[PDB]
Design a protein around this ligand. Structure first.
Ligand SMILES: C[C@H]1O[C@H](CC(=O)O)CC2=C1C(=O)c1c(O)c(-c3cc(O)c4c(c3O)C(=O)C3=C(C[C@@H](CC(=O)O)O[C@@H]3C)C4=O)cc(O)c1C2=O
Ligand SMILES: C[C@H]1O[C@H](CC(=O)O)CC2=C1C(=O)c1c(O)c(-c3cc(O)c4c(c3O)C(=O)C3=C(C[C@@H](CC(=O)O)O[C@@H]3C)C4=O)cc(O)c1C2=O
Lengths: 213, 209
């Protein structure tokens, strides 16, 4: 062991995790890479759970919640989200982690704070700015999973196409809509589906917002 | 006692409700029906392809209604709530969901039914196909979250995330201080109705002229 810290340990874990995925991450695996005994490891970071939280928190430094600006709101919200997504893309299995874990931690609440600022900044009231953030982050995760599981795109490529084949060759009299919509369902264009989900939620917010009429 | 795939999955779902997903091995299920891996793998295939059918059998509890003059936005919600009750009446069912497509026979009927309703409001091809997809995710996510509160059939932990957040330095964390309640604890029935409205209105803006 060289000078071990709760940061060199984490930067190490993540290293393995990109490389090889969630299940290859174990305590014994980790302590191996770093050239140390279980003592030093369990000291800074604990069992496997705690470790994933620390892993989660550190990569978060990557996202950016911009400071509120004169009439850029909608875009400033898209920026923010599109930023968070770019994060999930680089790092294997990170979304899997996110589903059953608290959005807590240094980065975790320096992040909520700036998320709440910007939203409330849209002339949005309490309950709606609170929940709103939940829904966005919820929205962007799900998406990131969806993409997570898409050679590369050859297995998905043909599956999608064989799905697209069955749909159109379905009978028209009993299935007018699905015959009509075989593309827009099987479309494996995540980029544009993503900008859509955003357009929608956001307008749902703005509309939600100034309801006081 | 003629064994059939429908009988197989009524037992696999009967133990899933009564004991819990994590305990549904192929092993267990086989014992219950007093039958070998032979006859069980003969229909349903393996643990994973079996789930698909379990999911596809229960989706029968969802009732997408026939489109009616003036009431579009209303009809959508009824559909959205009925899905949510399905997830509410069987444990772990969401966990499964967030891994699988509704390519099942059952699944396909309601995709047609749903998309018909959505396209009745003035939703151009695209809007409507993702409108649906979008709505699916939201209701799925919610129920996973609801199930995590442990009800149906913890509020100790949450209350302790309220104290904690409220107790931050007020100047460095004003927004987090002021929103302590609505973030930590929130009635589940309230959080659903909000997102439903949000998205529906969101899709409505999408329709335009
Ligand atoms: C790291 C932190 O700051 C960076 C920028 C910086 O300051 O360096 C940007 C950022 C930071 C940050 O901490 C952050 C968040 O914590 C959240 C966020 C806030 C939340 O309140 C939540 C979630 C969130 O992602 C969830 O993913 C989820 C939930 C609830 C659960 C529900 C379930 O258990 O199934 O689902 C997912 C895991 C949630 O409540 C959403 C966000 O968009 C962000 C951010 O954008
Ligand atoms: C069974 C079928 O018919 C009944 C009506 C009847 O039987 O008379 C009603 C109904 C039926 C039906 O099949 C149905 C659906 O298939 C869907 C649906 C449509 C979809 O397009 C999807 C999902 C869906 O549940 C997902 O759960 C999911 C995805 C994709 C993934 C992505 C992820 O979250 O990681 O998430 C889950 C697995 C999805 O695309 C959403 C729905 O609201 C419905 C329905 O309401």
């Amino acid at each position: 062991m060289a000078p071990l810290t709760q940061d060199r340990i984490v930067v190490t874990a993540l290293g393995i995790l990109d490389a090889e995925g969630l299940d290859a991450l174990s305590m014994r695996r980790l302590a191996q890479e770093l050239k140390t005994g279980h003592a030093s490891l369990y000291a800074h970071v604990g069992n496997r759970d705690e470790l994933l939280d620390l892993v989660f928190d550190i990569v978060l430094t990557e996202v950016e919640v911009p400071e509120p600006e004169p009439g850029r709101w909608a875009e400033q919200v898209k920026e923010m989200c599109r930023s968070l997504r770019r994060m999930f893309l680089a790092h294997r299995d990170l979304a899997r982690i996110a589903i059953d874990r608290v959005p807590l931690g240094p980065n975790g609440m320096v992040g909520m704070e700036r998320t709440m600022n910007l939203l409330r900044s849209g002339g949005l009231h309490d309950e709606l700015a609170a929940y709103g953030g939940d829904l966005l982050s919820t929205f962007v995760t799900a998406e990131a999973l969806e993409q997570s599981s898409r050679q590369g795109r050859e297995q998905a490529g043909v599956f999608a196409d064989q799905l697209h084949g069955y749909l159109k060759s379905l009978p028209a009299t009993s299935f007018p809509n699905l015959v009509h919509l075989a593309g827009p369902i099987t479309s494996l264009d995540s980029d544009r589906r993503f900008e859509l989900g955003l357009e929608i939620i956001i307008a749902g917010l703005l509309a939600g917002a100034g309801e006081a009429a």
